[PDB]
Amino acid sequence: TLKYPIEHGIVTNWD
Amino acid sequence: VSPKEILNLTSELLQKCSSPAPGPGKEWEEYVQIRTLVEKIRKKQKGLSVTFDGKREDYFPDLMKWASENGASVEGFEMVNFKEEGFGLRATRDIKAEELFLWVPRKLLMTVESAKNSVLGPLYSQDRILQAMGNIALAFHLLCERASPNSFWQPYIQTLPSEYDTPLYFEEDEVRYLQSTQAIHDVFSQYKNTARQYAYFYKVIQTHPHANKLPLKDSFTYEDYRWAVSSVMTRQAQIPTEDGSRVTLALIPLWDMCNHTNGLITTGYNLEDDRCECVALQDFRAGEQIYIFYGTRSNAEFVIHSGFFFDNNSHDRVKIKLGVSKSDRLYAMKAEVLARAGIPTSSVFALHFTEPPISAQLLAFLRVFCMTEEELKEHLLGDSAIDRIFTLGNSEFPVSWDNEVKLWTFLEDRASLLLKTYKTTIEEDKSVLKNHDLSVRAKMAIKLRLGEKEILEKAVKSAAVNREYYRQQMEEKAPLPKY
Ligand SMILES: Nc1ncnc2c1ncn2[C@@H]1O[C@H](CSCC[C@H](N)C(=O)O)[C@@H](O)[C@H]1O
């Protein structure tokens, strides 16, 4: 579908 | 208040938050200890170093004009302060599903790449924490530009919220509602990581020559760091680089003002036009709020990382840790079958509120976890073994009726055991929400702990149902589905 789907507030690792 | 005492407190804070975990039994006490130091530091500081004279809505026109001059869409919607979600976008005209209504060129975005070319660039080249973690890099990027009155991104920064509902902003008694839950450990880690990062970067800013020109060297309060990381974690997104070869984290102005509803991702990056594009998730009549789908995140991730609790989250889940015991006599075979299936010997799995509570990988683990030795050999030897591995995560092809009865029996018992580790019941949580008047942050915590137990409760019911289905097929001697 979309080549680069964009996630609002993507969960990242902070430590 | 002298700068010598502040650095003394930050020095004490960095040593406390760098200590190893004092064990799960002392984490609440470690939490309250860290809170006490942070509030002491926070009470001796002046809050947000940079504050703006106007109200939040006074700056939205500048944001719209700034975004128009650089090629973003500004027609067809307006900023409204909605009671339920806060500020959002409302449609000024009818917008049909799948219509491209919103686009943002890369020039407007704040990214790790734009942080590298900023005043923070020199310090970025020296600190390994910044280089390994773009989320923190974005956070400091936002801070330096906030304290730069001529930053290119000033129209976007002056429209950001001044406070959030992430657990970093909760009171101690609000977090206390989460005692005995899975979620509270992530709250502990988020608070400890944030305090350690502030203190570590407070000292780094004062010792590195590459940080001499930063505005943060003049002033850098704890309130600055909490606001910046909450701004990033509630809004940030991953986009491709201009090369398209890899990914980076970004703040997307205008677009990030949309609030969340259930649906599908309708926002993609257009590498040809080099812009973020967003098509309507559904029909939006004029005067209706425009929503987007943030992603398939649980309510624990929404509360902790996004700062809100979403009712009717169809993608909710809880964690569950499982592993094959070293004292099991069939450990070697079970670990080998799991290895050939690409499944670790021990892992954290997910229980869902969905129609099947477990994914294909959890189902395959539990099948091997309950296999007899004769069943393990058939998955390790002969011309049919790889075909047996292939169907392990498929509910349509059981190993045997007995293996299914044993795995659903185990899952029913473990989920029941998990429920008995909470301080409250489901009916007790419902009475709290019904009989007490609570803040929004308090209701988030209580609904968070309620949701954990309701997912476990439903997994108990679905495991008991599945146990009876397969026990029926066993007493009736039904033929096993094949291939
Ligand atoms: N469905 C929802 N219910 C409640 N709050 C929501 C929501 N979707 C988004 N939010 C709020 O919006 C934030 C993401 S950024 C969206 C714009 C934000 N309301 C603002 O004033 O800038 C979240 O941290 C949460 O506070």
Author numbering:
A (entry chain Y): 66 to 80
B (entry chain A): 19 to 501
Please share text taken word for word from the publication where this structure appeared:
Here we elucidate the structural and molecular determinant(s) of target specificity of histidine vs. lysine in the active site of SETD3. To facilitate the methyl transfer reaction, SETD3 provides a local environment that promotes deprotonation of the target nitrogen N3 of histidine (and concomitant protonation of N1).
In addition, we determined the N255A mutant structures in complex with H73-containing and K73-containing peptides, respectively. Pairwise comparison between the WT and mutant enzyme complexed with the same peptide revealed identical overall structures with root-mean-square deviations of 0.4–0.5 Å across all Cα atoms. In contrast, the activity on H73 is in the reverse order (WT≫N255A>N255V).
